[PDB]
């Protein structure tokens, strides 16, 4: 799960 980036 979670997410992140940076785009
Ligand atoms: C993004 O995740 C890293 C790893 O857990 C943390 O060290 C970091 O503090 C975190 O960044 C925060 C601050 C930011 C970039 N303004 C965003 O709100 C993110 C989602 O959370």
Coordinates of C-alpha atoms and ligand atoms in Angstrom, one line a residue:
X1 CA 0.0 0.0 0.0
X2 CA 1.2 3.6 0.6
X3 CA 2.1 5.8 -2.5
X4 CA 4.9 8.3 -3.1
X5 CA 6.3 10.4 -6.0
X6 CA 7.6 13.0 -6.7
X7 CA 6.0 13.7 -10.1
Ligands
LIG1 C1 7.1 11.5 2.3 O1 7.4 10.2 2.8 C2 8.8 10.2 3.4 C3 9.1 8.7 3.8 O2 8.1 8.2 4.7 C4 8.8 11.1 4.6 O3 10.2 11.2 5.1 C5 8.4 12.5 4.2 O4 8.3 13.4 5.4 C6 7.0 12.5 3.5 O5 6.7 13.8 3.0 C7 5.5 14.4 3.6 C8 5.6 15.9 3.3 C9 5.1 16.2 1.9 C10 6.1 16.0 0.8 N1 4.8 17.7 1.9 C11 3.8 15.5 1.6 O6 2.7 16.0 2.4 C12 4.0 14.0 1.9 C13 2.7 13.1 1.5 O7 4.3 13.8 3.2

